[PDB]
Amino acid sequence: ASQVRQNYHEDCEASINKQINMELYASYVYLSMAYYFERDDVALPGFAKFFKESSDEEREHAQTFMKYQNKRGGRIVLQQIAAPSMQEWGTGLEALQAALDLEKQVNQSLLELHSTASGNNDPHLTKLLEDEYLEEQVDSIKKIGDMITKLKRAGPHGLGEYMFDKELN
Amino acid sequence: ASQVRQNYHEDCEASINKQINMELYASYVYLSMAYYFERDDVALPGFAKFFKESSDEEREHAQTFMKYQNKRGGRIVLQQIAAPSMQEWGTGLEALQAALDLEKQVNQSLLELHSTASGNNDPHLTKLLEDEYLEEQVDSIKKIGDMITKLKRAGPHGLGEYMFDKELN
Amino acid sequence: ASQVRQNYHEDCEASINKQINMELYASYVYLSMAYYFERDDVALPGFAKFFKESSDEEREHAQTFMKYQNKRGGRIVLQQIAAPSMQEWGTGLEALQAALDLEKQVNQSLLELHSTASGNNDPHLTKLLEDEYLEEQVDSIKKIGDMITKLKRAGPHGLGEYMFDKELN
Amino acid sequence: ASQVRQNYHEDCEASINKQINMELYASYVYLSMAYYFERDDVALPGFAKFFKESSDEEREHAQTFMKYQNKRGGRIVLQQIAAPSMQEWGTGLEALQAALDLEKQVNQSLLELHSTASGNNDPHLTKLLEDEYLEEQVDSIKKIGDMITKLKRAGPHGLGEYMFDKELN
Ligand SMILES: [Fe+3]
Ligand SMILES: [Fe+3]
Ligand SMILES: [Fe+3]
Ligand SMILES: [Fe+3]
Ligand code: NI
Ligand code: NI
Ligand code: NI
Ligand code: NI
Ligand code: NI
Ligand code: NI
Ligand code: NI
Ligand code: NI
């Protein structure tokens, strides 16, 4: 084993590698959305900026897990990153609804990782998940939920979508 | 009696204690409204901020009456603070209408306190009420009335409610 | 359910609402103490300031739980706030002893909330409690314990109470 | 009559002249106390400063009434200023007790002046009394009451009197 490895279960190591792939996938989905909203026939620059920054954040989430893997003496194994589920994302509201669903899927995976870490009595890893991931995920889900409600109020189509887009820009 | 007490009628002392409870109740109502407007299915941050600041102000009104009670040599008696009349406040307009009704109820109580003070020939207390409470109350009622009119013009639902909320934020 | 709700048990939601009421009650108790110590026949401005700031802090604790309820998709339910157990709090030492007892009651409630969250496998909530509440509570209990010991040394009556009051101011 | 005189009753004019004398008398009493506390066998510099500043304030109160008399077209009539009731004021506590009694006598005179003004339907004068005199008087009575309580706690003799004197300096 690695000279640093201590109290680090192989199941947690493997689950971290799977989570790295999921974070990279989420980054790719948000990158797709970002440039969809810069199409000349879409032109929603607030949504584009929101999803560009979300894509950057998920790439950083993946990197933080890669750093963690190395810190504990596990070994990073990278797999193919799936194509985003769509090439075109529809309205601003439909993209936010897809984002909410994705964030909740990621949250479920993080909670399953926490259960794996708890069951293997790894408090360093439950700590990482609670402080660096679970809090960010709940905050993101509440923010996107708020955004869906505000957009449904303002629009969700036409002038209201145009005006809501400005609050993101 | 207190070593400081002079020209301070027991009826005014008791009426101040009842008003302290009413100010604390109004603070509680506005606190309820503030966090109602931060629900993920409401998401009106301008309304939330307006009612948060209103809640803070009413708590300060209560404290100023508590300080006054002590200044005159009366004794503060604190009672239960009733639960707000609602748990959910409806639309922004319905909350403002409830706020206007509450502010007018508080105003009526303050005017009755002024009549009690006048009838007991307490010009220090009629002074406090005129300068620190009655002016603020009339200004608040005019402001909320204005807000109701502006929101009815802009909305009061949908995009207009969304846009009006921004002027409060 | 709320569009944001995930892994949030109804028992935790209800326990958070009960804790909100307890924090508001503690705020009310400390508000009572604060203005008791500004009576002309008490006149302990250091104690008054200590309990005024404590009252503000407990109101903030309540608000942080209200924000948390909304963040997780629970629904805030506000109840009557009981009158403080006393109208007059006696000596500075007796008030600190009452405060220590109240802080330990609040701590016990927070620990029971943590046990509820743990038993329902909610690591986001055990996280909130550990980082935002349990640490503050233990620090507050140690501070008030220290204060009781210092006041018993200095006074606890007469000149020593007068001098101790200055270290709080 | 004066070219400026309007709605100014001769009874109010005479009562203002009597109040001018009372304010000057109070200034003289506090001047006596101030230098009593600078005797080599008393040596309480905090008390001395407190009463020096109180003496200055009462002289300013007299001058504000003289300015008011002129403003309304009344005519200032100045009378003998009585010697202070004592030449030696005893302990710090006895001086504060004498000051509290004097401030309450002045307050009673001001309230009688307000009743005279009210009965003669002079709202300019009831205004002056409420804003410039009655508020200051109640604040002064509460402050001296607080001071008596703090000094009784700290001392009122010996080391506690020595230490209390420092908080005034
Ligand atoms: Fe992520
Ligand atoms: Fe108010
Ligand atoms: Fe608390
Ligand atoms: Fe005066
Ligand atoms: Ni579609
Ligand atoms: Ni996020
Ligand atoms: Ni309705
Ligand atoms: Ni107001
Ligand atoms: Ni006792
Ligand atoms: Ni605390
Ligand atoms: Ni004597
Ligand atoms: Ni004064």
TrEMBL record, chains A, B, C, D:
Keyword Iron among record annotations: yes
GO biological process: intracellular iron ion homeostasis; iron ion transport
Domain Ferritin-like diiron residues, every copy: 6-155
Record-listed Fe(3+) 1 binding positions: 23, 58
InterPro entries: Ferritin, Ferritin-like, Ferritin-like_diiron, Ferritin-like_SF, Ferritin_DPS_dom
Keywords linked to the UniProt accession: Iron, Iron storage, Metal-binding, Oxidoreductase, Zinc
Binding residues annotated for Fe(3+) 4, in chain numbering: 23, 58, 136
Amino acids binding Fe(3+) 7: 58, 103
Residues noted as binding Fe(3+) 2 in the record, renumbered to the chain: 23, 58, 61
Signal peptide as annotated in the record: none
Matching CDD domains: Euk_Ferritin (cd01056)
GO molecular function: ferric iron binding; ferrous iron binding; ferroxidase activity
Keyword Cell inner membrane in record: no
Family statement: Belongs to the ferritin family.
Role of this protein: Stores iron in a soluble, non-toxic, readily available form. Important for iron homeostasis. Iron is taken up in the ferrous form and deposited as ferric hydroxides after oxidation.
Name of this chain's protein: Ferritin
Organism expressing this protein natively: Penaeus japonicus
